[PDB]
Design a protein around this nucleic acid. Structure first.
Ligand SMILES: [Cl-]
Ligand SMILES: [Cl-]
Ligand SMILES: [Cl-]
Ligand SMILES: [Cl-]
Ligand SMILES: [K+]
Ligand SMILES: [Mg+2]
Ligand SMILES: [Mg+2]
Ligand SMILES: [Mg+2]
Ligand SMILES: [Mg+2]
Ligand SMILES: [Mg+2]
Ligand SMILES: [Mg+2]
Ligand SMILES: [Mg+2]
Ligand SMILES: [Mg+2]
Ligand SMILES: [Mg+2]
Ligand SMILES: [Mg+2]
Ligand SMILES: [Mg+2]
Ligand SMILES: [Mg+2]
Ligand SMILES: [Mg+2]
Ligand SMILES: [Mg+2]
Ligand SMILES: [Mg+2]
Ligand SMILES: [Mg+2]
Ligand SMILES: [Mg+2]
Ligand SMILES: [Mg+2]
Ligand code: NA
Ligand code: NA
Ligand code: NA
Ligand code: NA
Ligand code: NA
Ligand code: NA
Ligand code: NA
Ligand code: NA
Ligand code: NA
Ligand code: NA
Ligand code: NA
Lengths: 56, 92, 194, 237
RNA sequence: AAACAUCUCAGUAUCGGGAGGAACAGAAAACGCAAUGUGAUGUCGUUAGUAACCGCGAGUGAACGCGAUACAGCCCAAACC
RNA sequence: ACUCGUACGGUCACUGAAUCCUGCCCAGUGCAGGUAUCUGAACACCUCGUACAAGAGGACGAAGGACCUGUCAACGGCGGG
RNA sequence: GCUUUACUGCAGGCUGUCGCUGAGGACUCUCACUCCGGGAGGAGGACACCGAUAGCCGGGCA
């Protein structure tokens, strides 16, 4: 079976959804963890220095 | 080659010819307290130790003469250039 | 004349001899069965405690913390590393055990602040330190001219910023002259070289 | 290279775990205050999914209902006893001391009260040879002479289901069904049939181990494969 | 470093913990232009690419002092009650 | 984790239903056992050195190695004259 | 990426030593410590575990 188009047909599973805490469609309803803000994993807000250039 | 144990020659100390006695330089023992010894201990750590991770070079086919010429009257020795000699045996 | 306290001090100069030796052999049995942070009603080394700021007063707290002995509990590299950075066994943390102890205690009492701490011995695999913490919100402390300083906002989380006695020594701030070129005023402003 | 299969095992992931939630009971000798008065009645005989051997359901006097490691010859209605004064009949459990030498035994404790550790698989049995006030010498199914505290409890008889190994699996499918009830990864791909990156015997233009198969006891995981610390190999001699 | 292992990139990137409006440091078990001398601590200029480190290779790299800025000095533990 | 498991077990490998069979080789390499003697680190110990210290040397000697043995359904070998 | 008796190192295993650690070149005991037991108590025991270090093995890994 082709890994491309033919394998795209079984994709009717809901995972990432609108997050209660940040509003982004990143709350993974299976993991109950937001990949954008960290809700469900961290009380503190998800954030990293690599999200911007080193000297900025 | 052969070489006399004693023979007349110039003494740089006495500043005049006198009988000298020839001897092969016996290696001196290390004390292990030289600066390089302390640097070895100090600088060796986790991982490769740079220069201290190296091992004994090798050998030239024939070594040069390594001798001491001792004045028979003032007892002071002097060193000379050596020359390649597969073997050096003294006469008497 | 000699204070009674001087006797506690003198006994602890040699925790392995005399009566103290036997107390320890007895005590540790119970300690090894206690948790990570145990609040205790009275300091095991009263002289040491009073010397560091302890006062039999409201808002003054003491707790004994146990921490494992030894070097860093470190995981081996999982990617490329030059030989120099491949070690695991001999690497040791730069923060001493006493300091680890002070932090574990402070976290246990989120509202209190660390005043100081001292050692109370060790067995073969762990060390024990008693930490003196203070309630900066209790009026009995806010009115004490000797301790009220610890109530100021800039003293919040002092232990986590190395403002503790053990923190400052471990930071290389003991000496005022030769040797402290890279430690004072801070390790960070000096580029992290001490 | 990559971690070898033996290393994937230790992580305890689903593929390597036993289907514990599907198991029935953790067979262990009952605890008796003392006296031995404890007796019960066999209420049923069941299949043990973790051992491919039968096991017995027992209702004890004090109301307790527990499955038991069943020796051969135990049936519904039988009365089993557990204690120092237990009669000496198959199916009963008592300390090696109260057991007459020369009698076959199973589910032997390693340390008094641990509930039984030795001789528990199908049809096996231990052999109580010597007694004493200090040591009870038992011969385990492997043939080893084991010195045990005479206070160690045991069950009289040989374990039920003997002869299971006599029948060949014949087909892959039968192994399959058994393997599905154990904490094991099956089937087994030979190391020499793998790539170098996956196993020390992997690689090559044809199939053969790279080095000799006998590996040192000190070899690290990832390398300890083949014949581990073999004192010898082959059949000759 | 014209490869590379110590070294270098660099205690940098990145990660964990935490404070403030600024942090941190701070009233000598200092300095050691050795003195009949200086006098808490930051910082700026300089000292100086000097001393020191280094397959003594490539590279690395202070401090005292001095001129400035701003200046500030105190509280316990104990003795005796 | 294996494991609600316990040698009729389960781990680690090789070969790959049945049938007839599976010879010779332990020198090298691997594993394993033994070991008078030899070798074999550090601590403690002894000697020298230093009012201390660095350092040099001795005594003792673990695993390991030398040495001996077992082992090929262990890696493998089975020629020239 | 992969290999190995390439170079150099790093995990891991084995082994000595020090700490925990106690009483009277081989030995007993019990009190730490470890395991079994619901408990009483039983087994083991200054060893083991753990922390530190030293020698050997060490393409398992960089
Ligand atoms: Cl010569
Ligand atoms: Cl704090
Ligand atoms: Cl099977
Ligand atoms: Cl001055
Ligand atoms: K590099
Ligand atoms: Mg794909
Ligand atoms: Mg090194
Ligand atoms: Mg600053
Ligand atoms: Mg069970
Ligand atoms: Mg079979
Ligand atoms: Mg399965
Ligand atoms: Mg296969
Ligand atoms: Mg293939
Ligand atoms: Mg490989
Ligand atoms: Mg084949
Ligand atoms: Mg083959
Ligand atoms: Mg380069
Ligand atoms: Mg160069
Ligand atoms: Mg630098
Ligand atoms: Mg200076
Ligand atoms: Mg006062
Ligand atoms: Mg337990
Ligand atoms: Mg490689
Ligand atoms: Na150094
Ligand atoms: Na706190
Ligand atoms: Na430093
Ligand atoms: Na192969
Ligand atoms: Na280059
Ligand atoms: Na290159
Ligand atoms: Na260098
Ligand atoms: Na001047
Ligand atoms: Na051979
Ligand atoms: Na052999
Ligand atoms: Na590649």
């Amino acid at each position: 079976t082709g890994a491309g188009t033919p394998s795209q047909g079984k994709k009717n599973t809901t995972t990432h959804t609108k997050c209660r805490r940040c509003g982004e469609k990143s709350y993974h309803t299976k993991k109950k963890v937001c990949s954008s803000c960290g809700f469900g994993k961290s009380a503190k807000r998800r954030d990293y220095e690599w999200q911007s250039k080193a000297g900025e | 080659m052969q070489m006399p144990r004693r023979f007349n020659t110039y003494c740089p100390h006495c500043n005049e010819h006198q009988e000298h006695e020839v001897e092969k330089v016996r290696s001196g023992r290390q004390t292990g307290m030289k600066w390089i010894d302390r640097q070895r201990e100090r600088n060796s750590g986790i991982g490769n130790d740079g220069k201290f991770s190296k091992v004994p070079g090798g050998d030239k086919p024939t070594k040069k003469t390594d001798l001491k010429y001792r004045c028979g009257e003032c007892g002071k020795a002097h060193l000379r250039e050596g020359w390649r000699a597969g073997r050096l045996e003294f006469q008497e | 004349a000699r204070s009674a306290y001087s006797y506690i001090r003198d006994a602890w100069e040699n925790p392995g001899d005399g009566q103290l030796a036997e107390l320890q052999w007895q005590r540790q049995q119970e300690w090894r069965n206690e948790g990570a942070v145990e609040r205790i009603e009275r300091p095991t080394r009263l002289d040491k405690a009073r010397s560091q700021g302890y006062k039999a007063k409201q808002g003054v707290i003491v707790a004994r913390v146990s921490v494992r002995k030894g070097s860093a509990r470190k995981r081996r590299h999982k990617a490329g590393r030059r030989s120099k950075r491949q070690g695991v066994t001999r690497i040791t943390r730069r923060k001493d055990i006493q300091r680890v102890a002070e932090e574990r205690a402070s976290r246990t009492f989120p509202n209190l602040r660390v005043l100081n701490s001292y050692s109370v011995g060790q067995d073969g695999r762990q060390k024990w330190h008693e930490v003196i913490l203070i309630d900066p919100n209790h009026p009995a402390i806010q009115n004490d001219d000797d301790l009220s300083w610890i109530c100021a906002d800039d003293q919040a989380d002092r232990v986590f910023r190395g403002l503790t006695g053990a923190g400052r020594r471990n930071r290389g701030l003991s000496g005022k002259g030769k040797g402290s070129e890279k430690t004072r005023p801070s390790l960070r402003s000096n580029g992290g070289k001490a | 290279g990559r971690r070898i299969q033996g290393q994937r095992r230790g992580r305890g992931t689903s593929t390597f775990r036993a289907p514990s939630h599907r198991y029935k009971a953790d067979l262990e000798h009952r605890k008796v205050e003392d006296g031995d008065v404890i007796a019960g009645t066999v209420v049923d005989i069941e299949h043990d999914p973790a051992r491919s051997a039968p096991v017995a359901a027992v209702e004890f006097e004090d109301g307790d209902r527990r499955l038991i490691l069943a020796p051969e010859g135990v049936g519904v209605g039988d009365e089993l006893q557990v204690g120092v004064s237990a009669e000496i009949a198959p199916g009963n459990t008592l300390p090696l001391a109260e057991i007459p030498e020369g009698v076959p035994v199973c589910n032997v404790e390693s340390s008094p009260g641990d509930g039984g550790k030795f001789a528990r698989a199908s049809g096996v049995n231990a052999q109580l040879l010597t007694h004493d006030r200090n040591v009870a010498v038992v011969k385990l199914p492997s043939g080893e002479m084991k010195r045990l505290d005479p206070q160690c409890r045991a069950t009289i008889g040989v374990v039920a289901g003997g002869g299971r190994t006599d029948k060949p699996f014949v087909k892959a499918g039968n192994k399959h069904h058994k393997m599905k009830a154990r904490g094991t990864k099956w089937p087994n791909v030979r190391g020499v049939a793998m790539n170098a990156v996956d196993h020390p015997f992997g690689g090559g233009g044809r199939q053969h181990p790279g080095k000799p198969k006998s590996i040192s006891r000190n070899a690290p995981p990832g390398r300890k494969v083949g014949d581990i610390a073999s004192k010898r190999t082959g059949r000759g001699g």
